[PDB]
Design a protein around this ligand. Structure first.
Ligand SMILES: NC(=O)c1cc(NC(=O)c2cc(-c3cccc(N)n3)ccc2Cl)n(-c2ccccc2)n1
Ligand SMILES: O=c1[nH]cnc2scc(-c3ccc(F)cc3)c12
Length: 290
């Protein structure tokens, strides 16, 4: 149910196994593990560089063919706000996908660790939002539907650089963010919960939810409610409240992403243009004054 596979239906670089030196396990899911590794002879002037390596547990013909198609699409995705894909290693089991290493981990973990529970300021929160929007503009321009846009599926590198990307293990690491196939219901618009239909318009809705995560420093949307209760609020048209750290100007943008009718939601290009203008000239808003 990945966006990569969704886009596949609707030359890959090969790295020698011996050029990869596994250093530590970063995470794991049902499909395999993710390692921190050193990769030799990959980038110029960097005889050694850190990479994140996704290892696939299953080595069957269908898993191999799916892997290849995903690797072809990942090679094609090239943007400043998309996690860099360096290539594969198909030298037997486990099949490996090599990505750049994002030193601050996923954006949800980053927000929670840089929040009140020092804390990121308004200008930094707007820069994070603008970068996530820029990656989504790129994906929409390719008619690529993410299907699971959320802060847990964004990564943070050196110098507050934020990019869209994940190692396909969020349904395991953040199982609490999904409901049973495992659907990310708190991030979904009513037509996706009801008809299980994902579009660029449903990605825009999830972007509004990402904005809410950003300005609550990574809190789960509808945190006071159970999964079935959250489905009810969304299908009935209840809206997430404006976070305290969120200026009215950003809340108006979220509300634009959350129009009930998919055809009435702002385009991501317009959402990005608005957030970019606010990141360069932040509104004078003190969260303490509300
Ligand atoms: N839930 C799943 O099974 C699932 C969900 C995903 N992520 C995507 O499809 C996905 C991945 C990227 C991306 C791009 C660049 C680097 C980078 N690291 N990621 C962007 C958008 C999407 Cl939408 N994978 C998955 C399957 C294979 C590899 C990684 C993840 N598996
Ligand atoms: O990831 C870890 N977490 C806790 N203890 C250990 S001991 C060794 C590891 C390790 C080292 C290299 C790897 F490729 C994978 C795992 C490790």
């Amino acid at each position: 149910g990945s966006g990569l596979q969704g886009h596949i239906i609707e030359c890959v670089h090969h790295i020698k196994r011996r050029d990869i030196v596994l250093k530590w396990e970063l995470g794991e899911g049902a499909f395999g593990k993710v390692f921190l590794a050193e990769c030799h002879n990959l980038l110029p002037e960097q005889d050694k560089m850190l990479v994140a390596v996704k290892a696939l547990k299953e080595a069957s013909e269908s898993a191999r063919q799916d892997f290849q198609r995903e690797a072809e699409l990942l090679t094609m995705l090239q943007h400043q706000h998309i996690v860099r894909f360096f290539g594969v290693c198909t030298e037997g089991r486990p099949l490996l996908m090599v990505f750049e290493y994002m030193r601050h981990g996923d954006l949800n973990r980053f927000l929670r660790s840089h929040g009140p529970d020092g804390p990121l300021g308004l200008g930094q929160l707007l820069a994070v939002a603008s970068q996530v929007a820029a990656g989504m503009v790129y994906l929409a321009g390719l008619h690529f539907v993410h299907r699971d846009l959320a802060t847990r599926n964004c990564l943070v590198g050196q110098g507050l650089v934020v990019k869209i990307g994940d190692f396909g293990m969020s349904r395991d690491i953040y199982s609490t963010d999904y409901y049973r196939t495992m659907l990310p219901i708190r991030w979904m618009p009513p037509e996706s919960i009801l008809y299980r239909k994902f579009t660029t318009e449903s990605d825009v809705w999830s972007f509004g939810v990402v904005l809410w995560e950003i300005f609550t420093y990574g809190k789960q949307p509808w945190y006071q409610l159970s999964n079935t209760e959250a489905i009810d609020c969304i299908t009935q048209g209840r809206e997430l409240e404006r976070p305290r750290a969120c200026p009215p100007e950003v809340y108006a943008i979220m509300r634009g992403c959350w129009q009930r009718e998919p055809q009435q939601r702002h385009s991501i290009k317009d959402v990005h243009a608005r957030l970019q203008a606010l990141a360069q000239a932040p509104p004078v808003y003190l969260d303490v004054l509300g």
